[PDB]
Amino acid sequence: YGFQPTNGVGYQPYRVVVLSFELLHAPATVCGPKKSTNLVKNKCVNFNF
């Protein structure tokens, strides 16, 4: 590419980042802004592990 500043859009350089989340079968890894919140037992509950 010979990029030049006086190029019409669609010929100017774009930077690209491709995030690819993979989950082969690990036991746990990165996440997001969770909360932890304690747990319980013996009660019908709505859970996320």
């Binding site: 082969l24 079968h25 690990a26 036991p27």
Partner: peptide
């Protein structure tokens, strides 16, 4: 030389627990 395996080279195809289950 060459030799004969008999029943060798079986690995767990992945995580996920499992019990008595003739899984295919």
């Amino acid at each position: 030389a060459y030799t004969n395996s008999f029943t060798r080279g079986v690995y767990y195809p992945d995580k996920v627990f499992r019990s008595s289950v003739l899984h295919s």
